Each structure stands twice: as structure tokens, then as C-alpha cells.
Amino acid sequence: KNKDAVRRPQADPALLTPRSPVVTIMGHVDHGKTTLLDKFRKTGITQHIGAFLVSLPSGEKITFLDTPGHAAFSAMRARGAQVTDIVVLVVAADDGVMKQTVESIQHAKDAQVPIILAVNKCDKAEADPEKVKKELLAYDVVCEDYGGDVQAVPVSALTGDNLMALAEATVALAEMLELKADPNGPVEGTVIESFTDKGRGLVTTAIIQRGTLRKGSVLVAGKCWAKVRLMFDENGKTIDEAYPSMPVGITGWRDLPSAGEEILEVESEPRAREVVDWRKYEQEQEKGQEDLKIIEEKRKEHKEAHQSNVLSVIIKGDVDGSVEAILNIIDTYDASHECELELVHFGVGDVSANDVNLAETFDGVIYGFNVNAGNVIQQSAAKKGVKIKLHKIIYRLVEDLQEELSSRLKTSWDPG
Amino acid sequence: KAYRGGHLTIRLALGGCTNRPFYRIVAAHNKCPRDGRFVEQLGSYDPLPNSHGEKLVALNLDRIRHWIGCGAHLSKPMEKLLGLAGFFPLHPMMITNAERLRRKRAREVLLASQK
Amino acid sequence: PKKPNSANRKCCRVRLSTGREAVCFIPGEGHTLQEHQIVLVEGGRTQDLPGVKLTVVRGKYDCGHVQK
RNA sequence: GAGGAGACAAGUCGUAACAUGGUAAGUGUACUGGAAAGUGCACUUGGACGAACC
RNA sequence: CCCCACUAUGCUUAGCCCUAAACCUCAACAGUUAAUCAACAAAACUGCUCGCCAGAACACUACGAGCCACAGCUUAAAACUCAAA
RNA sequence: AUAGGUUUGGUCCUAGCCUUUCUAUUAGCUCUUAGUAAGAUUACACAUGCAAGCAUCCCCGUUCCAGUGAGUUCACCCUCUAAAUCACCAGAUCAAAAGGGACAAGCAUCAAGCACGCAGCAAUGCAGCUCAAAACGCUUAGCCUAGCCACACCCCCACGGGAAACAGCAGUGAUUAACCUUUAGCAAUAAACGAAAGUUUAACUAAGCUAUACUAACCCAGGGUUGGUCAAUUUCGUGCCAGCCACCGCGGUACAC
Ligand SMILES: Nc1nc2c(ncn2[C@@H]2O[C@H](COP(=O)(O)OP(=O)(O)OP(=O)(O)O)[C@@H](O)[C@H]2O)c(=O)[nH]1
Ligand SMILES: [Mg+2]
Ligand SMILES: [Mg+2]
Ligand SMILES: [Mg+2]
Ligand SMILES: [Mg+2]
Ligand SMILES: [Mg+2]
Ligand SMILES: [Mg+2]
Ligand SMILES: [Mg+2]
Ligand SMILES: [Mg+2]
Ligand SMILES: [Mg+2]
Ligand SMILES: [Mg+2]
Ligand SMILES: [Mg+2]
Ligand SMILES: [Mg+2]
Ligand SMILES: [Mg+2]
Ligand SMILES: [Mg+2]
Ligand SMILES: [Mg+2]
Ligand SMILES: [Mg+2]
Ligand SMILES: [Mg+2]
Ligand SMILES: [Mg+2]
């Protein structure tokens, strides 16, 4: 019997009510997206997709999703594009249209989200917004300058010039889009990030899309369920409600949902547990079919018959998105012939005795991305010969991983 | 557990199950837990009306007197139970609560008559 | 298995939570227990195997049930 | 590191034990030997001496 | 294994060593032959006492301890293993 | 135990092992309702919120309740006698410190401990005391459950130091096979306070979650097993392979997969 909880059918026109817009600031590394966000909020590498509910001088409220620009966080950029409904791409005319700029453009095309170009660093010399628009013409972003629909705004995030025009354009495009959602009924949303706080347990920063979330609701997402225990803002102050298009951190998660997973409100805890059991059973059936094919191959082989340079790595991250990014970087390994890379265990949270034990068992190395390892863990690692490597930057960690691969050998694997 | 200070008190220890209260009149050290160690069980009290519309109270009057002599205090509910039993004078708060109830019902009746 | 029984019993060397390394017999027709996978192991010696004194509990952690 | 035990388990050299096991077996001890084991001294029957005379 | 030669040794003295199938494999003391008694062996028991035993093997073992003992003796386990011995 | 299966070519004896029974934890598969009972694996680390006030100022309480089981013969009996209650005293109740007795488990491959005694007013003198009827020593354990003992982050203690304390309730990270709400009210009982109306209380009460259990219902049943011990198999497929078993065992063209 199918017990899955599915998204409610599209909202009725009468039930629809105006809601705020969701804007993602995409772009390639160090094009001032962070500076623009800081200026808009009135407050050097981005590594987390951050949701902020900003209030404009007009009194409107807009949810900004600041995404990393580094090539590694393609998953983060894709998730931001999918969840958002407007993409305020930021491009530095001095640098010009780049690979990640085109990647963001393609993600916007997939998501079917209106794109607004913001020329950053327009104050600096050699800034050529006209050339930027020309180049975008090839990538199909036809700016209104060259007989198009895309609005291009010259700005200088550092000097805060024309940001008022950018905000006005964003508000106008939002009004044109006419975004609305049902504020009542079971809640629906998407997980923007998930992590483990030593105080608050498993937390998920999500963005509501329908209904209103409140303490005591039962949510289900992926193979996870929760009884909403604490809803908090970016600054942690508790909020009694989370209307559609509101970024909220939700505690009370029994299991840590995967980033980007859909969150749906169900009637009760037993119903949520039934849904989770059904989803786990579905995953089990899929994996069982795969294993059945493999086992049938092996058994045919057996019936007919009857007739080293290896690096084991544990990955520990501060957030599930970070862990996934490191996992993708690892999977981009291609030089298995000269040295093999094996991923013993990946997880979110500070280096734990279990991680140390796995490292000892497999002669592995623990790579902690934005995580700590208490003195007890350090002493145990020294005692057992494990090596812990705590890195705060993705490319620094990747460099260290490459160095270890070469030590095992330089490594032919180029992360790209 | 060596308790500093304290003094014997004749009080009601709540036994029974949920939604089903029942009391054991026990002369116990005041600092001891409510339902814990007690010097002597001086009686019992079933606050729920039985098949005959009665709240059975049993008071081991002899030992109650002996403990009052030996210097045990009385919790307010126990004092009110004894006052109802006539072993003690009616408690001043029982009398005052009776008068408050009389006045409350009088107000209710007056308003019902007016409306 | 020891004589007279003849077979190729599937077993796996696992480092238990207690830090000990033991051999667990994998029941069922077919498995997919690869290296680094986490399993649950209970008692009950496999009679025909000397020294294999444990069994992987099917359906728990990374050991899926037996495919029909 | 190496030893010891056990198990698994087909081989190599012998046939030490179980029949008087082809030198009866064994206990203690000593020397000797691929290897079981051999021999020396005392001890045991958990061997026999065939049970009238011949 | 059979034959020959010869040594330690068997002997005496003074010390050590303290082991045997050191077994009559049947503990000491007192008592009974009555209602028998797995098998075999050297019939069955009663009372009292001390010592000893508690599946096999690991094990006349390792460790610890004691000893004139230095390849030793006494005491003596455990882990893994088996459904038997 | 009312016992059963198992040594063997077979019998008898001894003997271990396992089965049958009842609980509890965990796991697999599955699950409708209501009432009640019980509910971290860890003396490892803790975000957050609350958990002690009362009261005409002083006093009194926060030393209680609540918690955990690290440690562990401080619990029980007697002698004496503190503190506290009996509005003051009275002796009565309650019960400390002290003194006497009793008081867990295994290891003797822990057999010697090394001052462990006595007398004297004192000076000092005697050289004694415990122990194979288990001294001394190591390891383990909370216990004798109306409840009791012990601990309160560690240094036994806690001036001092290490350091910044949930073994209070809710909750969290780590850890484990083990995983309850970041509820409501002091209406009831208990406690503190007050002369009192009364105030406070994560004690407690009433709820929340969990087949862990008991009860009751259900007009929607799953789990396990079917060679013997042990209730119960039809046809196929495989063919000493796949596989199964608590013990004996089965699988070489199967009532055991
Ligand atoms: N001159 C100038 N510099 C600017 C302007 N806006 C931003 N910047 C700077 O340009 C850089 C932009 O990089 P960020 O936005 O901080 O980071 P990022 O884009 O995520 O890049 P990574 O995090 O490295 O992937 C920073 O040094 C900004 O301070 C601007 O208008 N003018
Ligand atoms: Mg940036
Ligand atoms: Mg022979
Ligand atoms: Mg011979
Ligand atoms: Mg001989
Ligand atoms: Mg010779
Ligand atoms: Mg003799
Ligand atoms: Mg000997
Ligand atoms: Mg020896
Ligand atoms: Mg020795
Ligand atoms: Mg269950
Ligand atoms: Mg303990
Ligand atoms: Mg020893
Ligand atoms: Mg603590
Ligand atoms: Mg202390
Ligand atoms: Mg707590
Ligand atoms: Mg947790
Ligand atoms: Mg449990
Ligand atoms: Mg057949």
C-alpha cells in the first residue's frame, strides 16, 4: 500500500495570496556578490548557500539566496536556482562573462527563472558593460540594451552605486511575475542546508513555499521526519510563524535531511513515520533490484564455473552541502590506475571516535572541512596513528588531498 | 538519610493510579518525600464516591492522638478531614470557604432572577 | 565447511564496535557486502564452520534483505 | 619476530600402538635418534604362558 | 630387534635429588551378613572422619610461587576447539 | 522437572551439550482502538528555557524535593547522647557524631601482614596483635526495595587547585544493539514562607511520544515453523552447488535447501 505523502495540487486562484520573491545571486568567484548582499542588508570565499529575508525601503520583503561562486559548488548553485524564482546574476564587467557565469545562466534556463544582470565593479577602469551584454548575447541572455527582456544594471557594490536601481528593477520584475501562494494548509518547502549543532541537534535551513509553519508541526523530507521544535531566523531569534517564501531554520529533525529535499507537512507523528518507512522501503526495492542483477551475474558465473597505492579517506563536513561538494570533487578522481582513492565514510559533524576508529581500521586519513577535533580526539588520533586534517577552505583541502595522493605515488588528477 | 531539623507531620501521602486518587494518612518526617518513608500509617482516605455515594475515611484515632501528643504537626488537608470528622473543630478556612460559596451562589441566584 | 559438509560459505571479516576483528557468516542466497559497509552482527555459530561464531543480521544497516 | 595448542585438511618418510600388532604393552628416570621411537635399571598387568600326569 | 667389546652406571662413603603402573589402581577406625547387586573386577553395605573429584582436550602445560633441584621437581590455570570424550 | 534429543556395529553406566517453560533488552517482519503501568546505553560533553521563594524590612528556606549508581561491608541491633518537634519547660518523639556486635561475590596461582598489642596516672616497661575456621591483598557489584547506602564535574575531602560543571525537568552532540515532550497548572497531596487571605514549586497533578507489559475491544493478520526431539508439506527448481540447523543432521537426480 502506497503511503507516500505527495505535494498538494497547485493552489486555487482564490486561495492564492501575494507572497515575497525569492532571488538568487549567482555568478563566478569574486564578482562582488557578497559585497552586493552586504550592501543590500546594510551590514574571502563563500562556501554556504545562505538565505536572508531582507526588507527593502519600500517595505517589501525579499528572500536572497547568496550562493558560492567557486566551480566546486555546482550542486549548491543548481539547488539555489531550482528553489529561487528570480536569478539576479552578478557579473564583473572587468572580468567579463566566465565559465561559472555561463553555468549559472544554464541553471537559470533549466529552472525557467527570469534573469537580471548586475554589472559589478562598474566603478573600476576597463569595465565594459556593453561588451558584457554583447558576450551574453551568445549565451542567449539578450539584455534590454540589445533589444531584449533581460534588465542590465551597472553597479559598484563596493561604492553602493545604482543599487537602488537594482532593487527597483527586482521589485518591478517581482510585481510583473505576480508571485502568490496559499498561506494556509499543510506546509511545503525545500531544505536549503542541513547540519548538526551540538546544542540544537539536527537543524535544517529551509525556505517555505506553501502554508505556514508553526511549532509542533510534523514534517517529512526524504527518509527523515521531524516535529518542529525551534524555528529561528538568521540571527536565531525564534519566529512563531514562517509564511511562504520565508527562510527559516527548523530544529527537531530526527534524521538529517539531504540538501534540496522537499519538506511536506503531514497529519501526525505516526503518519510521518509511516511515510518514512514507505520511502525507505522504496529505496530498498530499488537497491534490491540493483543487487539482484549483480547477484544474478555472479551466480551465472559460479554455475558455469561449477559445470597497495591506495588512499582511504574519511570526510567530515560542517554542512551536508559541503560534504556533498567534497564528495563530488572526490568522484572527479580519474587517476585510479596510478593510485586508488577510497572513501571509507562521509558525514557531518566534528571528528568523532567512530571516524578515528574507521581511519585506524583502514589506515585512512580524516579530512575535516570546517570542523573541529577536540583534544581527546587529537590524543586518540596520535595514539592510533590516524592523521586529522582540518581545512577551512575547499581548495586548500583539495590541495592537501592532492599532496597526499602524490605522497602515495605528482598525482595526475586535476580537479578542474 | 540523616535529615537536619524537620519534625513529624501527620499528612496525606498520595497513592493510587492516574485519574484515581487515593490517600494514606501517614505520620511521616516532614522532610521525607511525600510518598516515601513514613513513621506510621494512621489511616486511609478514598476521595472518590463509592457505590454508596461515600468517601471512606479511616482514622486510627488512638495512634493519631498518640502522635499529636508526641509532637506531630497536621497538614491542612488532614486538619480539615479531622474537622469534618468532628475530632477537631471545623477549620477556619472550611468555614470561610463555606461562606464564600454561600455568597457566590447567592450572586448567581440573584443574577438568574434578574435575567 | 568442515567435512562431511561441502560448500563455499560466504563470510566477512569485520572490525566490531568493541575493536575486535571477527568473522561473520553472511546468511541468505546472495549478498552485496563490500568493504567499508556497516553491518549488524548477532550471535549463533554456523555449525559447519569452525570459529565463525557470528551472523550478519539481514535488512539492517547496509545489508539488504535477500532478494526473492 | 619466533615458539605452543587447536582446528582445518590432502600430501612425504616410516609402521610406533590396537592381534603375542609381528621385539608384549606401559610408569619413572638417563643417553641416543628424521620421525614415530630404541636401549639401560626398577616397578605394574591395564598380556600370555594353553591350566591332572604327560 | 640378533652377536662382540667397552664406558657412565648398578657397589662403599658424605651430600643432593624427592620421581614411579610409589597399584592390592580398593583411605583410616568400628560394625553387619540382612533385606543383594548397572557391567567387569576382589560380594553387598552401615556409622564416623579426613583427602580428593565435577565433560573432553589445551595440561605431568604457561605464568606465579617454593625447593642444595638449573633440559628439574611440587602446586597449576586460562584463551581458541568439540559434541562428544 | 513428569522429562526429551545426542556418544555406539549394538547394550549398560557416567558425563557434557542442547530442547521443552517464564521473564527482560535488542534486531528482522508486521500492527486497528481505548485505559493503565514502565521508558538514554554511558559518573562522557552541553546550546537554550525553566526548576526557591515567602514576608511589613529581621528572620526562615534554597542542607528539603528532584537525580545517578561512579564508589562501596557508613544501612541493621545495642550503649550513650547531639541537633530538631512537642506555643515555654516537660520528659515523649525523631535521630547525628562516638563506642560494641552483625554485615556481598570470586581469586589461596593473594599465605604471610609488618607494628598491625597490652600494661602504667605519668615516666616508661613487656613484645606483643591478625592469619589456612582465610589475616593481608587483587577484581567485580549499589543494597537486605513501604525503601536504604553512597556521589553531587575531577583532585576520596575541597581551604586550595584543575576548570567553568543538567547524575533537576524538557532537550542536544558523542557513544551504544539500546535514544520519550525543548506540554499545561499549582485545581489535588507534599514542601517553603506568612498570623492569615494567600504566593512559589519541571515535586506533583493532568496531558504528549513509544506494541516494552497488563487489561478490554476489533465489524482490518501478521510472524515463525512443518525430518526427529516438536504441532504440522503438495508440485516444481537446484544437485554435496545454492543453501539450511538449537542438538542430531539435510543437499551427489530433497516431507530438512
Ligand atoms: N572594485 C570593486 N570590488 C568589488 C565590488 N564589489 C565587490 N568587490 C570585491 O570583489 C570581490 C568579490 O568576491 P566575493 O563576492 O567576496 O566572493 P565570491 O564572489 O564568492 O568569490 P569566492 O568566494 O572566492 O568564490 C571582493 O574582494 C569584493 O570586496 C565593486 O563594486 N568594486
Ligand atoms: Mg561572493
Ligand atoms: Mg607393531
Ligand atoms: Mg611391539
Ligand atoms: Mg619398555
Ligand atoms: Mg642405542
Ligand atoms: Mg610397588
Ligand atoms: Mg612427572
Ligand atoms: Mg612443569
Ligand atoms: Mg615457572
Ligand atoms: Mg519488536
Ligand atoms: Mg558500579
Ligand atoms: Mg598463575
Ligand atoms: Mg555532568
Ligand atoms: Mg567531590
Ligand atoms: Mg536531563
Ligand atoms: Mg542524540
Ligand atoms: Mg529501549
Ligand atoms: Mg527432487
CSV table of N, CA, C and O in Angstrom, one decimal, chain A residues 305-351:
chain,number,residue,atom,x,y,z
A,305,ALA,N,31.2,-21.9,-13.9
A,305,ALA,CA,32.5,-22.4,-13.3
A,305,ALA,C,32.3,-23.8,-12.7
A,305,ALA,O,33.2,-24.7,-12.9
A,306,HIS,N,31.2,-24.1,-12.1
A,306,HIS,CA,30.9,-25.4,-11.5
A,306,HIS,C,30.8,-26.4,-12.6
A,306,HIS,O,31.2,-27.6,-12.4
A,307,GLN,N,30.1,-26.1,-13.7
A,307,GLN,CA,30.0,-27.1,-14.8
A,307,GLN,C,31.3,-27.7,-15.1
A,307,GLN,O,31.5,-28.9,-15.3
A,308,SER,N,48.8,-1.6,-1.0
A,308,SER,CA,49.0,-1.0,-2.4
A,308,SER,C,48.8,0.5,-2.3
A,308,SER,O,48.5,1.1,-1.3
A,309,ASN,N,49.1,1.2,-3.5
A,309,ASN,CA,49.0,2.6,-3.5
A,309,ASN,C,47.5,3.0,-3.5
A,309,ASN,O,46.8,3.3,-4.5
A,310,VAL,N,46.9,3.0,-2.3
A,310,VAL,CA,45.5,3.3,-2.0
A,310,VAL,C,45.4,4.2,-0.9
A,310,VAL,O,46.1,4.1,0.2
A,311,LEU,N,44.6,5.3,-1.0
A,311,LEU,CA,44.4,6.3,0.0
A,311,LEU,C,42.9,6.2,0.5
A,311,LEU,O,42.0,6.4,-0.3
A,312,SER,N,42.8,5.8,1.7
A,312,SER,CA,41.5,5.7,2.4
A,312,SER,C,41.2,7.1,3.0
A,312,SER,O,42.1,7.6,3.8
A,313,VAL,N,40.0,7.7,2.8
A,313,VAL,CA,39.7,9.0,3.3
A,313,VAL,C,38.4,9.0,4.0
A,313,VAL,O,37.4,8.4,3.5
A,314,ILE,N,38.3,9.5,5.2
A,314,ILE,CA,37.1,9.9,5.9
A,314,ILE,C,36.9,11.4,5.6
A,314,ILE,O,37.8,12.2,5.7
A,315,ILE,N,35.6,11.7,5.3
A,315,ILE,CA,35.2,13.1,5.1
A,315,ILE,C,34.3,13.5,6.2
A,315,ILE,O,33.2,12.9,6.4
A,316,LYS,N,34.6,14.6,6.9
A,316,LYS,CA,33.7,15.2,7.9
A,316,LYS,C,33.5,16.7,7.6
A,316,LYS,O,34.5,17.4,7.5
A,317,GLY,N,32.2,17.1,7.4
A,317,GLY,CA,32.0,18.4,7.0
A,317,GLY,C,31.1,19.2,8.0
A,317,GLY,O,30.4,18.5,8.8
A,318,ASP,N,31.0,20.5,7.9
A,318,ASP,CA,30.2,21.3,8.8
A,318,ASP,C,28.7,21.2,8.3
A,318,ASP,O,27.8,21.2,9.2
A,319,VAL,N,28.5,21.1,7.0
A,319,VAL,CA,27.1,21.0,6.5
A,319,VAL,C,27.1,19.9,5.4
A,319,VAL,O,28.1,19.5,4.8
A,320,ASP,N,25.8,19.5,5.2
A,320,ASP,CA,25.6,18.4,4.2
A,320,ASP,C,26.0,18.9,2.8
A,320,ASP,O,26.5,18.1,2.0
A,321,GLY,N,25.7,20.2,2.5
A,321,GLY,CA,26.2,20.7,1.2
A,321,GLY,C,27.7,20.7,1.0
A,321,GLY,O,28.2,20.3,-0.1
A,322,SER,N,28.4,21.0,2.1
A,322,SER,CA,29.9,20.9,2.0
A,322,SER,C,30.3,19.5,1.8
A,322,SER,O,31.2,19.2,1.0
A,323,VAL,N,29.7,18.6,2.5
A,323,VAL,CA,30.1,17.2,2.4
A,323,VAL,C,29.8,16.7,0.9
A,323,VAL,O,30.7,16.0,0.3
A,324,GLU,N,28.7,17.1,0.4
A,324,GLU,CA,28.4,16.7,-1.0
A,324,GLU,C,29.4,17.3,-2.0
A,324,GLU,O,29.7,16.7,-3.0
A,325,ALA,N,29.7,18.6,-1.8
A,325,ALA,CA,30.7,19.2,-2.7
A,325,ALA,C,32.0,18.5,-2.6
A,325,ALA,O,32.7,18.2,-3.7
A,326,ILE,N,32.5,18.1,-1.4
A,326,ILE,CA,33.8,17.4,-1.3
A,326,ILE,C,33.6,16.0,-2.0
A,326,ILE,O,34.5,15.5,-2.6
A,327,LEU,N,32.4,15.4,-1.8
A,327,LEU,CA,32.2,14.1,-2.5
A,327,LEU,C,32.3,14.2,-4.0
A,327,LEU,O,32.8,13.3,-4.6
A,328,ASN,N,31.7,15.2,-4.5
A,328,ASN,CA,31.8,15.4,-6.0
A,328,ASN,C,33.2,15.6,-6.4
A,328,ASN,O,33.7,15.1,-7.4
A,329,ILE,N,34.0,16.5,-5.7
A,329,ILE,CA,35.4,16.6,-6.0
A,329,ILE,C,36.1,15.3,-6.0
A,329,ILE,O,36.9,15.0,-6.9
A,330,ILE,N,35.8,14.5,-5.0
A,330,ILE,CA,36.4,13.2,-4.9
A,330,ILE,C,36.1,12.3,-6.1
A,330,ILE,O,36.9,11.7,-6.7
A,331,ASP,N,34.8,12.3,-6.5
A,331,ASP,CA,34.3,11.5,-7.6
A,331,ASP,C,34.9,11.9,-8.9
A,331,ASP,O,35.1,11.1,-9.8
A,332,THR,N,35.3,13.2,-9.0
A,332,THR,CA,36.0,13.6,-10.2
A,332,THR,C,37.4,13.0,-10.3
A,332,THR,O,38.2,13.4,-11.2
A,333,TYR,N,37.8,12.1,-9.4
A,333,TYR,CA,39.1,11.4,-9.5
A,333,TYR,C,39.1,10.5,-10.7
A,333,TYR,O,38.1,9.8,-10.9
A,334,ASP,N,40.2,10.5,-11.4
A,334,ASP,CA,40.3,9.7,-12.6
A,334,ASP,C,41.6,8.9,-12.7
A,334,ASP,O,41.7,8.1,-13.6
A,335,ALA,N,42.5,9.1,-11.8
A,335,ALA,CA,43.9,8.5,-11.9
A,335,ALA,C,43.9,7.3,-11.0
A,335,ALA,O,45.0,7.0,-10.4
A,336,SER,N,42.8,6.5,-10.9
A,336,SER,CA,42.8,5.3,-10.1
A,336,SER,C,44.0,4.4,-10.4
A,336,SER,O,44.4,3.6,-9.6
A,337,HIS,N,44.4,4.4,-11.7
A,337,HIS,CA,45.4,3.4,-12.1
A,337,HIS,C,46.7,3.6,-11.3
A,337,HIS,O,47.3,2.7,-10.8
A,338,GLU,N,47.2,4.9,-11.3
A,338,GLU,CA,48.4,5.1,-10.6
A,338,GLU,C,48.3,5.1,-9.1
A,338,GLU,O,49.2,4.6,-8.3
A,339,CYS,N,47.1,5.6,-8.6
A,339,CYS,CA,46.8,5.4,-7.1
A,339,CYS,C,45.3,5.4,-7.0
A,339,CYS,O,44.6,6.2,-7.7
A,340,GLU,N,44.8,4.6,-6.1
A,340,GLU,CA,43.3,4.4,-5.9
A,340,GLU,C,42.9,5.3,-4.7
A,340,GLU,O,43.6,5.5,-3.8
A,341,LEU,N,41.7,5.9,-4.9
A,341,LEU,CA,41.1,6.7,-3.8
A,341,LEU,C,39.9,6.0,-3.3
A,341,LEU,O,39.0,5.8,-4.1
A,342,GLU,N,39.8,5.7,-2.0
A,342,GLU,CA,38.6,5.0,-1.5
A,342,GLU,C,38.1,5.9,-0.4
A,342,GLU,O,38.8,6.5,0.4
A,343,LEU,N,36.7,6.1,-0.4
A,343,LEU,CA,36.0,6.9,0.6
A,343,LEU,C,35.4,6.0,1.6
A,343,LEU,O,34.3,5.4,1.4
A,344,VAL,N,36.0,5.9,2.8
A,344,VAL,CA,35.6,5.0,3.8
A,344,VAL,C,34.2,5.4,4.4
A,344,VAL,O,33.3,4.6,4.5
A,345,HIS,N,34.1,6.7,4.7
A,345,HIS,CA,32.9,7.2,5.4
A,345,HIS,C,32.9,8.7,5.3
A,345,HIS,O,33.9,9.4,5.5
A,346,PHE,N,31.7,9.2,5.0
A,346,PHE,CA,31.5,10.7,4.9
A,346,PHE,C,30.3,11.0,5.9
A,346,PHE,O,29.4,10.2,6.1
A,347,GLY,N,30.4,12.2,6.5
A,347,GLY,CA,29.4,12.6,7.4
A,347,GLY,C,29.5,14.1,7.8
A,347,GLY,O,30.4,14.8,7.3
A,348,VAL,N,28.6,14.5,8.6
A,348,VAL,CA,28.5,15.9,9.0
A,348,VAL,C,28.7,15.9,10.5
A,348,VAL,O,28.1,15.2,11.3
A,349,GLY,N,29.7,16.8,11.0
A,349,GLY,CA,29.9,16.9,12.4
A,349,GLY,C,31.4,16.8,12.7
A,349,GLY,O,32.2,16.3,11.9
A,350,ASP,N,31.8,17.2,13.9
A,350,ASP,CA,33.2,17.2,14.3
A,350,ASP,C,33.7,15.8,14.3
A,350,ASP,O,33.0,14.8,14.4
A,351,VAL,N,35.0,15.7,14.2
A,351,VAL,CA,35.7,14.4,14.1
A,351,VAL,C,35.3,13.6,15.4
A,351,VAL,O,35.5,14.0,16.5
